[PDB]
Amino acid sequence: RKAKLLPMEEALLP
Amino acid sequence: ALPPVAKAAQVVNQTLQLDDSYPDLDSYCRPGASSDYEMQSSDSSWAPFHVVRHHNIPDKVFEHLNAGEVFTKLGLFAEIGYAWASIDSSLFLWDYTHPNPELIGYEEATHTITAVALVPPKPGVFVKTITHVLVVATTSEIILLGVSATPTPSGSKSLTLYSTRMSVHRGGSDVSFIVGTKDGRIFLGGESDTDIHEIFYQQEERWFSSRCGKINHSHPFGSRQQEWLRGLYVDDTRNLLYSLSNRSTIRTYHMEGPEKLTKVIEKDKTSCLRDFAHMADSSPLFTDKTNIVALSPIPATEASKLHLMALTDTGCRLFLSATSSASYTALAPQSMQLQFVKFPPRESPTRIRTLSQLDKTSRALDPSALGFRFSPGYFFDVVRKHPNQDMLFVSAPDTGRIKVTQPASALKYFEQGTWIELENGNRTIEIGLTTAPFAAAKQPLGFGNELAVQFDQVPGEFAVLTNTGVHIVRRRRLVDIFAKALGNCVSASDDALEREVRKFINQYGRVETIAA
């Protein structure tokens, strides 16, 4: 299963 | 005049100072050489290390690996209990502590993966829940992925990946080595040349600057002969970066700023050999034919002078100091010198139990293919005498003997050693620490006192990655040895215990033995 890559928006602040 | 608890507190304060006076590395690795070992059978209760369990590679990874068209590679993320496997342009991570792991697949990459690493993030860039950055280097580009390795009820980190839009074209230089600093700086090197690159990245997008950049810190030009890297090594406590070349040249770089990297020392094998010749004991185990196969930084918390260990293919551990020209303007060193050599042990591994000068001629660690050192001196050497089976030599400082030795001028690098056999077909790839870095104190004096921390931090454990699985090796404490030895005396005489106890007293002293 290809790993779900959550978005940049959550990753980097602010 | 002085009440009980205040009297006892006086004993505690003086005992704390006694433990914190444990000799520093520089003090028992003084200029000269040593071959001091007490070897233990791996099945003995006195073994300094032993294998506690093993984790096979998942079958699905074997399916992908044997489905490899051109290139495959394995590696370890021992800090979080994960391993990884790359197959051409595809990458697969998995928790090796889990009995039936699921494979975290990442196949966005377009070209062959040549290196993978897990580094700390740059502060003030990512959400706090991002614990690491995953660096994926291909033949075309380097890719950064956010990582969140949050612990689970079972005791194994849960790993989720985040995209970043952060990437840069590789260029003409291969990337086979990636290392990260405490502050999230990412350095790159490979098998094309000796140049060192750094990847920068920032949160904000600008019209004059991208979110992710790459620069060559070596600034090469003109005539250049063939030479490339065998490894990169970081020491945050000194803001240093070391590279090892295929010609056994050791280069030292200093991070004089958050974005600067300056080469400050370059020491080729000839220089090491010249230092070695000026020592009292020269040896045929170290010549112009000898190769240096690995480096291991020694942090400033452990030793002031000795900066670096270098392992030869003959099994010699070369301990090098480094010194600055001045005392004030971090201060960058400008000189490096081979000061002390620990020569190999003589005892070879045997199925059946076999029965004072400097030994500078042993071939027991010849050839040494891979080597690792962990504070306070745990040493792993992959000896490849035969092309099918690796033999693992593992040794530790004889902390008990070092602590009792008197006077200070009699201090030597005493060691306890053992041979751990891996089965036929096991080729060792990497060895990494799974527990927190060892430290009994905050400065060299007292730093290496294993005895003092027996009950404050778990024994060190090390993940040995092979082509068939991950083996867990655990350091054994005095109390572990003492308990095991006594367990063998349960069925014996009153004099059987006294005999075993006298072994401990002769090595550790009476107080340490009775305390155990």
Coordinates of C-alpha atoms in Angstrom, one line a residue:
Chain A
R1 CA 0.0 0.0 0.0
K2 CA 1.4 3.4 -1.1
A3 CA 1.9 5.5 2.1
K4 CA -0.6 8.3 2.5
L5 CA 1.4 11.6 2.3
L6 CA -0.4 14.2 4.3
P7 CA -0.3 17.7 3.0
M8 CA 2.4 20.4 3.4
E9 CA -0.2 22.7 5.0
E10 CA -0.2 20.6 8.2
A11 CA 3.6 19.9 8.0
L12 CA 5.0 23.4 8.1
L13 CA 3.8 26.3 10.2
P14 CA 2.4 28.9 10.5
Chain B
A1 CA 27.0 17.8 66.8
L2 CA 25.9 16.4 63.5
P3 CA 22.7 14.3 63.2
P4 CA 22.3 11.0 61.4
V5 CA 20.8 12.0 58.1
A6 CA 23.4 14.8 57.8
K7 CA 26.2 12.3 58.4
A8 CA 24.8 9.9 55.8
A9 CA 24.4 12.8 53.3
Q10 CA 28.1 13.5 53.8
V11 CA 28.8 9.9 52.6
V12 CA 26.5 10.4 49.6
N13 CA 28.2 13.6 48.5
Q14 CA 31.7 11.9 48.8
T15 CA 30.4 8.8 47.0
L16 CA 29.0 10.9 44.1
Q17 CA 32.4 12.6 43.7
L18 CA 34.1 9.2 43.7
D19 CA 31.9 8.0 40.8
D20 CA 32.4 11.2 38.9
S21 CA 36.2 10.8 39.2
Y22 CA 36.1 7.8 36.9
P23 CA 39.1 8.1 34.5
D24 CA 38.5 10.0 31.3
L25 CA 39.4 8.4 27.9
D26 CA 42.5 10.6 27.4
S27 CA 43.9 9.4 30.7
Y28 CA 44.0 5.6 29.9
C29 CA 44.6 6.1 26.2
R30 CA 47.8 8.1 26.6
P31 CA 50.3 8.3 23.8
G32 CA 51.5 4.8 23.1
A33 CA 49.7 1.5 22.4
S34 CA 47.9 -1.3 24.1
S35 CA 46.8 -4.9 23.4
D36 CA 45.0 -5.6 26.8
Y37 CA 42.1 -7.9 26.5
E38 CA 40.3 -10.5 28.5
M39 CA 38.3 -12.6 26.1
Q40 CA 35.1 -14.3 27.1
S41 CA 33.2 -17.1 25.3
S42 CA 29.9 -15.9 23.9
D43 CA 28.0 -18.5 25.9
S44 CA 29.7 -17.5 29.2
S45 CA 28.0 -15.7 32.0
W46 CA 30.9 -13.2 31.8
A47 CA 30.2 -12.3 28.2
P48 CA 30.1 -8.5 27.8
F49 CA 27.4 -8.6 25.1
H50 CA 24.9 -11.2 23.9
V51 CA 22.2 -11.7 21.4
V52 CA 18.7 -11.3 22.9
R53 CA 16.5 -11.8 19.8
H54 CA 16.3 -11.6 16.0
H55 CA 13.8 -10.2 13.5
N56 CA 13.6 -11.7 10.0
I57 CA 13.1 -9.4 7.0
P58 CA 9.4 -9.5 5.9
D59 CA 8.7 -11.9 3.0
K60 CA 7.2 -9.1 0.9
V61 CA 10.6 -7.3 1.0
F62 CA 12.2 -10.5 -0.3
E63 CA 9.7 -10.5 -3.1
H64 CA 10.6 -6.9 -4.0
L65 CA 14.3 -7.5 -3.5
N66 CA 14.4 -10.5 -5.8
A67 CA 12.3 -8.5 -8.2
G68 CA 15.1 -5.9 -8.5
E69 CA 16.2 -5.1 -12.0
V70 CA 19.4 -3.1 -11.4
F71 CA 20.0 -2.0 -7.8
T72 CA 18.9 -2.7 -4.3
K73 CA 20.0 -1.5 -0.8
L74 CA 19.2 -2.0 2.9
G75 CA 19.6 0.3 5.9
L76 CA 18.7 1.0 9.5
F77 CA 16.8 3.6 11.4
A78 CA 17.8 2.2 14.8
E79 CA 16.7 5.4 16.7
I80 CA 13.1 4.5 16.0
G81 CA 13.2 0.8 15.5
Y82 CA 12.7 0.9 11.7
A83 CA 14.5 -0.6 8.8
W84 CA 14.2 0.2 5.1
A85 CA 14.8 -1.3 1.7
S86 CA 15.2 0.4 -1.6
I87 CA 14.5 -1.3 -4.9
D88 CA 15.4 0.7 -8.0
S89 CA 13.1 3.8 -7.7
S90 CA 11.0 2.4 -4.8
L91 CA 11.4 2.6 -1.1
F92 CA 9.9 0.5 1.7
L93 CA 10.1 1.1 5.5
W94 CA 8.9 -1.2 8.2
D95 CA 9.0 -1.6 12.0
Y96 CA 11.3 -4.5 12.7
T97 CA 10.2 -4.9 16.3
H98 CA 6.7 -5.7 15.1
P99 CA 6.1 -9.5 14.5
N100 CA 4.1 -9.0 11.3
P101 CA 4.9 -5.5 10.1
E102 CA 3.1 -3.6 7.3
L103 CA 5.3 -2.1 4.7
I104 CA 5.3 1.7 4.4
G105 CA 5.7 2.1 0.6
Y106 CA 7.0 5.3 -1.1
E107 CA 7.3 5.1 -4.9
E108 CA 7.0 8.7 -6.1
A109 CA 10.6 8.7 -7.1
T110 CA 11.4 8.5 -10.8
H111 CA 15.1 7.4 -10.7
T112 CA 17.2 4.9 -8.8
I113 CA 17.5 5.6 -5.1
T114 CA 21.2 5.8 -4.0
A115 CA 20.9 6.9 -0.4
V116 CA 18.3 7.3 2.4
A117 CA 18.6 8.8 5.8
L118 CA 16.6 10.0 8.8
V119 CA 17.7 13.3 10.3
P120 CA 16.4 15.9 12.8
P121 CA 14.2 18.7 11.4
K122 CA 15.3 22.3 11.2
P123 CA 13.7 24.2 14.1
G124 CA 10.9 26.6 13.5
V125 CA 10.2 25.1 10.1
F126 CA 7.7 22.3 10.7
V127 CA 4.8 21.6 13.0
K128 CA 6.0 20.3 16.4
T129 CA 4.5 16.9 15.7
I130 CA 7.1 16.3 12.9
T131 CA 9.9 14.5 14.7
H132 CA 12.3 13.8 11.8
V133 CA 13.0 14.5 8.1
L134 CA 13.4 11.6 5.6
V135 CA 16.1 12.4 3.0
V136 CA 15.8 10.3 -0.2
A137 CA 18.6 10.7 -2.7
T138 CA 18.3 9.4 -6.3
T139 CA 20.5 9.7 -9.4
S140 CA 18.4 12.8 -10.4
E141 CA 17.4 14.6 -7.2
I142 CA 17.2 14.7 -3.4
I143 CA 13.8 14.6 -1.8
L144 CA 12.8 15.7 1.7
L145 CA 9.8 14.1 3.4
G146 CA 8.3 15.1 6.8
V147 CA 8.2 12.3 9.4
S148 CA 6.2 11.8 12.6
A149 CA 7.5 8.9 14.7
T150 CA 5.1 9.0 17.6
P151 CA 5.3 6.1 20.1
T152 CA 2.5 3.5 20.4
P153 CA 1.2 1.4 23.3
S154 CA 3.2 -1.5 22.1
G155 CA 6.5 0.3 22.3
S156 CA 7.3 0.9 18.6
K157 CA 7.0 4.2 16.9
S158 CA 4.1 4.8 14.6
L159 CA 5.5 6.3 11.3
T160 CA 3.5 8.6 9.0
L161 CA 4.9 10.6 6.1
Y162 CA 4.3 14.1 4.9
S163 CA 5.0 15.8 1.6
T164 CA 7.0 19.0 1.6
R165 CA 7.4 20.3 -2.0
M166 CA 11.1 20.5 -1.0
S167 CA 13.5 19.0 -3.5
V168 CA 16.6 19.9 -5.6
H169 CA 18.2 18.5 -8.6
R170 CA 21.2 16.4 -7.7
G171 CA 23.8 17.4 -10.3
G172 CA 26.8 15.5 -11.5
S173 CA 28.0 14.1 -8.1
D174 CA 26.7 10.8 -6.8
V175 CA 25.1 10.8 -3.3
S176 CA 25.8 7.7 -1.2
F177 CA 26.1 9.3 2.2
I178 CA 23.7 11.6 4.1
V179 CA 24.2 12.8 7.7
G180 CA 22.3 15.3 9.8
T181 CA 23.2 17.5 12.7
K182 CA 21.3 18.2 15.9
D183 CA 20.0 21.5 14.4
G184 CA 18.7 19.8 11.2
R185 CA 21.6 20.6 8.8
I186 CA 21.8 18.1 6.0
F187 CA 25.2 17.2 4.4
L188 CA 25.8 15.0 1.4
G189 CA 28.7 13.1 -0.2
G190 CA 29.3 10.2 -2.5
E191 CA 31.4 8.1 -4.8
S192 CA 32.1 10.6 -7.6
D193 CA 34.5 12.9 -5.7
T194 CA 35.3 14.2 -2.3
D195 CA 33.1 17.3 -2.4
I196 CA 30.6 17.9 0.4
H197 CA 27.2 19.5 -0.3
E198 CA 24.6 20.9 2.0
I199 CA 20.8 21.1 1.5
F200 CA 19.1 24.2 2.8
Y201 CA 15.4 24.6 3.2
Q202 CA 13.0 27.1 4.7
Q203 CA 9.2 27.5 5.2
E204 CA 8.6 30.6 3.2
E205 CA 8.5 30.8 -0.6
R206 CA 10.3 33.9 -2.0
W207 CA 10.4 35.4 -5.5
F208 CA 14.2 35.5 -5.3
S209 CA 14.8 32.2 -3.5
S210 CA 13.2 28.7 -3.6
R211 CA 12.1 26.8 -0.5
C212 CA 15.0 24.3 -1.0
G213 CA 18.5 24.8 -2.2
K214 CA 21.8 23.0 -2.5
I215 CA 25.4 24.3 -2.5
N216 CA 28.9 22.7 -2.8
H217 CA 31.0 23.7 0.2
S218 CA 34.3 22.4 -1.4
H219 CA 34.5 25.0 -4.2
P220 CA 36.7 22.7 -6.4
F221 CA 38.6 23.8 -9.5
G222 CA 41.6 23.1 -11.7
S223 CA 43.4 19.7 -11.7
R224 CA 41.8 17.0 -9.6
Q225 CA 42.9 13.4 -9.3
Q226 CA 40.5 10.5 -8.7
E227 CA 39.3 10.2 -5.1
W228 CA 35.9 9.7 -3.5
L229 CA 34.3 9.2 -0.1
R230 CA 33.7 6.1 2.0
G231 CA 31.6 7.8 4.7
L232 CA 30.6 11.0 6.5
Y233 CA 30.6 11.5 10.3
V234 CA 29.2 14.3 12.5
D235 CA 30.2 15.5 16.0
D236 CA 27.7 18.1 17.2
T237 CA 29.6 18.6 20.5
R238 CA 32.5 20.2 18.5
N239 CA 30.5 21.4 15.4
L240 CA 32.7 19.2 13.3
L241 CA 32.1 17.1 10.2
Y242 CA 34.6 14.3 9.1
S243 CA 34.9 12.6 5.7
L244 CA 36.8 9.4 4.9
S245 CA 38.1 8.9 1.4
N246 CA 38.9 5.8 -0.6
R247 CA 42.6 6.6 -0.3
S248 CA 42.1 6.7 3.6
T249 CA 42.4 10.5 3.7
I250 CA 40.7 12.0 6.7
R251 CA 39.3 15.5 6.2
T252 CA 37.9 17.7 9.1
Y253 CA 35.4 20.5 8.5
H254 CA 34.2 23.1 11.0
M255 CA 30.8 24.7 11.1
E256 CA 31.8 28.2 11.9
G257 CA 28.2 29.3 11.4
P258 CA 24.7 28.1 10.7
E259 CA 25.3 28.1 7.0
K260 CA 29.1 27.9 6.7
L261 CA 31.4 24.8 6.4
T262 CA 35.2 25.3 6.4
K263 CA 37.8 22.6 5.7
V264 CA 40.4 22.9 8.6
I265 CA 42.4 19.7 8.5
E266 CA 43.4 17.3 5.7
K267 CA 45.5 14.2 6.9
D268 CA 46.4 11.6 4.4
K269 CA 47.5 8.0 5.1
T270 CA 51.1 9.0 4.7
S271 CA 50.7 11.5 7.6
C272 CA 49.1 8.8 9.8
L273 CA 51.9 6.4 8.9
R274 CA 54.6 9.1 9.8
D275 CA 53.0 9.6 13.2
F276 CA 52.9 5.8 13.6
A277 CA 56.6 5.5 12.8
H278 CA 57.5 8.1 15.5
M279 CA 55.7 5.9 18.0
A280 CA 57.7 3.5 20.1
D281 CA 55.9 0.4 18.7
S282 CA 55.7 0.1 14.9
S283 CA 53.8 -2.9 13.4
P284 CA 53.4 -4.7 10.1
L285 CA 49.6 -4.4 10.7
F286 CA 49.7 -0.7 9.5
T287 CA 51.6 0.1 6.3
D288 CA 51.1 2.0 3.1
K289 CA 49.1 -1.0 1.8
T290 CA 46.7 -0.8 4.7
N291 CA 43.2 0.8 4.2
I292 CA 41.2 2.7 6.7
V293 CA 37.6 1.3 6.5
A294 CA 35.7 3.4 9.0
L295 CA 35.7 6.4 11.3
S296 CA 33.9 7.1 14.5
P297 CA 33.8 10.6 16.1
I298 CA 34.5 10.9 19.9
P299 CA 32.5 13.7 21.5
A300 CA 33.9 16.4 23.6
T301 CA 31.8 15.2 26.6
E302 CA 33.8 11.9 26.5
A303 CA 37.3 13.2 25.8
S304 CA 39.0 16.6 25.3
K305 CA 42.0 15.6 23.1
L306 CA 41.0 12.4 21.4
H307 CA 38.6 13.5 18.6
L308 CA 38.4 10.4 16.4
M309 CA 38.8 6.7 16.1
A310 CA 39.9 5.2 12.7
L311 CA 39.7 1.4 12.0
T312 CA 42.1 -0.3 9.6
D313 CA 41.3 -3.3 7.6
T314 CA 43.8 -5.2 9.8
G315 CA 41.7 -4.4 12.9
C316 CA 43.8 -1.7 14.4
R317 CA 42.0 1.1 16.2
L318 CA 43.8 4.4 15.6
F319 CA 42.9 7.1 18.1
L320 CA 43.6 10.7 16.8
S321 CA 43.8 13.9 18.7
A322 CA 43.1 17.3 17.3
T323 CA 44.3 20.7 18.6
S324 CA 43.7 24.4 17.7
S325 CA 46.6 26.7 17.2
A326 CA 45.2 29.1 19.8
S327 CA 42.8 29.3 22.8
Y328 CA 40.4 32.0 21.7
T329 CA 38.9 33.6 18.6
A330 CA 33.3 27.2 18.6
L331 CA 37.1 27.1 18.1
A332 CA 38.2 25.2 15.0
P333 CA 41.2 22.7 15.3
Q334 CA 44.0 23.0 12.8
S335 CA 46.1 19.9 13.4
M336 CA 45.4 16.2 13.8
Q337 CA 47.8 13.5 15.0
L338 CA 47.7 9.8 15.6
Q339 CA 48.5 9.4 19.3
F340 CA 47.3 6.0 20.5
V341 CA 46.7 2.6 18.9
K342 CA 44.7 -0.3 20.3
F343 CA 46.0 -3.4 18.6
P344 CA 43.7 -6.5 17.9
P345 CA 43.1 -9.3 20.3
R346 CA 44.8 -12.7 19.6
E347 CA 42.1 -15.3 20.5
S348 CA 40.1 -16.5 17.5
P349 CA 36.5 -17.9 17.8
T350 CA 36.2 -21.6 18.5
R351 CA 33.5 -24.2 18.8
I352 CA 35.4 -25.9 21.7
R353 CA 36.6 -23.9 24.6
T354 CA 40.4 -23.4 24.2
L355 CA 42.7 -22.9 27.2
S356 CA 52.6 -9.4 29.0
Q357 CA 54.3 -7.8 26.1
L358 CA 52.5 -5.5 23.6
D359 CA 50.9 -7.8 21.0
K360 CA 51.2 -5.8 17.8
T361 CA 51.0 -8.7 15.2
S362 CA 47.7 -10.4 15.7
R363 CA 45.7 -11.2 12.6
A364 CA 42.5 -12.1 14.4
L365 CA 40.6 -9.1 13.1
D366 CA 42.1 -9.3 9.6
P367 CA 40.2 -8.5 7.4
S368 CA 38.0 -5.9 9.1
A369 CA 35.2 -4.9 6.6
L370 CA 33.0 -2.7 8.9
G371 CA 33.5 -1.1 12.3
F372 CA 31.5 1.0 14.8
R373 CA 32.3 2.7 18.1
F374 CA 29.7 3.9 20.6
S375 CA 30.4 5.8 23.8
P376 CA 31.8 4.9 26.3
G377 CA 33.8 2.7 23.9
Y378 CA 31.6 -0.2 22.8
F379 CA 33.3 -1.6 19.7
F380 CA 31.8 -3.7 16.9
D381 CA 34.0 -5.2 14.2
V382 CA 32.7 -7.2 11.2
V383 CA 35.6 -9.6 10.4
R384 CA 35.3 -11.2 7.0
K385 CA 38.0 -13.9 6.9
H386 CA 35.7 -16.1 4.8
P387 CA 33.6 -14.7 2.0
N388 CA 30.3 -16.4 3.1
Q389 CA 30.2 -15.9 6.9
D390 CA 30.8 -12.8 9.0
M391 CA 32.3 -13.0 12.5
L392 CA 31.4 -10.2 15.0
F393 CA 34.0 -9.1 17.5
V394 CA 32.5 -7.0 20.3
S395 CA 34.4 -5.4 23.1
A396 CA 33.8 -2.9 25.9
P397 CA 36.1 -1.1 28.3
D398 CA 36.9 -3.1 31.4
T399 CA 35.1 -0.4 33.5
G400 CA 35.6 -2.4 36.7
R401 CA 39.4 -2.7 36.3
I402 CA 39.8 0.9 35.0
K403 CA 37.9 2.2 38.1
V404 CA 40.1 0.3 40.6
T405 CA 43.4 0.8 38.9
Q406 CA 45.9 2.8 41.0
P407 CA 47.9 5.0 40.5
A408 CA 46.8 7.0 37.5
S409 CA 50.1 6.3 35.7
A410 CA 49.2 2.6 35.6
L411 CA 46.0 3.2 33.6
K412 CA 45.7 1.2 30.4
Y413 CA 42.8 0.6 27.9
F414 CA 41.7 -2.7 29.5
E415 CA 38.9 -4.4 27.6
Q416 CA 36.4 -7.3 27.8
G417 CA 35.8 -8.9 24.5
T418 CA 33.8 -11.7 22.9
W419 CA 33.0 -13.2 19.5
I420 CA 29.4 -13.4 18.3
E421 CA 28.9 -15.8 15.4
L422 CA 26.4 -15.1 12.6
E423 CA 25.0 -18.0 10.6
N424 CA 26.2 -18.9 7.1
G425 CA 24.8 -16.4 4.6
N426 CA 24.5 -13.5 7.1
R427 CA 26.3 -10.5 5.6
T428 CA 26.3 -7.6 8.1
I429 CA 25.2 -4.3 6.6
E430 CA 24.9 -1.8 9.4
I431 CA 24.9 -1.5 13.2
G432 CA 23.0 1.2 15.1
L433 CA 22.2 2.1 18.6
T434 CA 18.5 1.5 19.7
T435 CA 18.7 3.1 23.2
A436 CA 19.6 6.6 24.3
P437 CA 23.2 7.6 23.9
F438 CA 25.4 6.6 26.9
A439 CA 26.5 9.2 29.4
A440 CA 27.3 8.8 33.1
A441 CA 28.5 12.4 33.4
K442 CA 28.6 15.7 31.5
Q443 CA 32.4 15.9 31.2
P444 CA 35.2 13.5 30.5
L445 CA 35.9 12.7 34.1
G446 CA 33.1 10.4 35.2
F447 CA 31.7 10.1 31.7
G448 CA 32.5 6.4 31.2
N449 CA 31.3 5.1 34.6
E450 CA 29.1 2.2 33.5
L451 CA 28.9 1.1 37.2
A452 CA 27.3 4.3 38.3
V453 CA 24.4 4.2 35.8
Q454 CA 23.5 0.5 36.1
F455 CA 20.1 1.4 37.6
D456 CA 19.4 4.8 36.0
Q457 CA 19.3 3.8 32.3
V458 CA 18.7 0.5 30.6
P459 CA 21.7 -1.4 29.2
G460 CA 22.7 -0.3 25.7
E461 CA 21.1 -2.3 22.9
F462 CA 22.3 -2.4 19.3
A463 CA 20.5 -3.5 16.1
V464 CA 22.7 -5.5 13.8
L465 CA 21.2 -5.4 10.3
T466 CA 22.1 -8.3 8.0
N467 CA 20.8 -9.4 4.6
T468 CA 18.4 -11.8 6.4
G469 CA 17.2 -9.9 9.5
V470 CA 17.9 -7.6 12.4
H471 CA 19.7 -9.1 15.5
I472 CA 19.5 -7.3 18.8
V473 CA 22.7 -7.2 20.9
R474 CA 22.6 -6.1 24.5
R475 CA 25.4 -4.8 26.8
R476 CA 25.6 -6.8 30.0
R477 CA 26.2 -5.0 33.3
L478 CA 28.1 -6.2 36.4
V479 CA 24.8 -7.1 38.1
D480 CA 23.8 -9.1 35.0
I481 CA 27.1 -11.0 35.1
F482 CA 27.0 -11.4 38.8
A483 CA 23.4 -12.7 38.8
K484 CA 24.1 -15.1 35.9
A485 CA 27.3 -16.4 37.6
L486 CA 25.5 -17.0 40.9
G487 CA 22.7 -18.8 39.0
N488 CA 25.3 -21.4 38.0
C489 CA 26.4 -21.7 41.7
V490 CA 22.9 -22.7 42.9
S491 CA 23.8 -26.4 42.5
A492 CA 27.3 -26.4 44.1
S493 CA 29.2 -26.2 47.4
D494 CA 29.8 -23.4 49.9
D495 CA 33.3 -23.2 48.3
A496 CA 31.9 -22.9 44.8
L497 CA 30.4 -19.5 45.5
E498 CA 33.5 -18.3 47.3
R499 CA 35.5 -19.2 44.2
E500 CA 33.2 -17.4 41.8
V501 CA 33.0 -14.4 44.2
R502 CA 36.8 -14.2 44.3
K503 CA 36.9 -13.7 40.5
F504 CA 34.7 -10.6 40.9
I505 CA 36.8 -9.2 43.7
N506 CA 40.0 -9.6 41.8
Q507 CA 38.5 -7.6 38.9
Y508 CA 36.0 -5.1 40.4
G509 CA 37.2 -4.9 44.0
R510 CA 35.4 -6.0 47.1
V511 CA 33.1 -3.0 47.5
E512 CA 31.8 -3.1 43.9
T513 CA 31.3 -6.9 44.1
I514 CA 29.4 -6.7 47.4
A515 CA 27.3 -3.8 46.0
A516 CA 26.4 -6.1 43.0

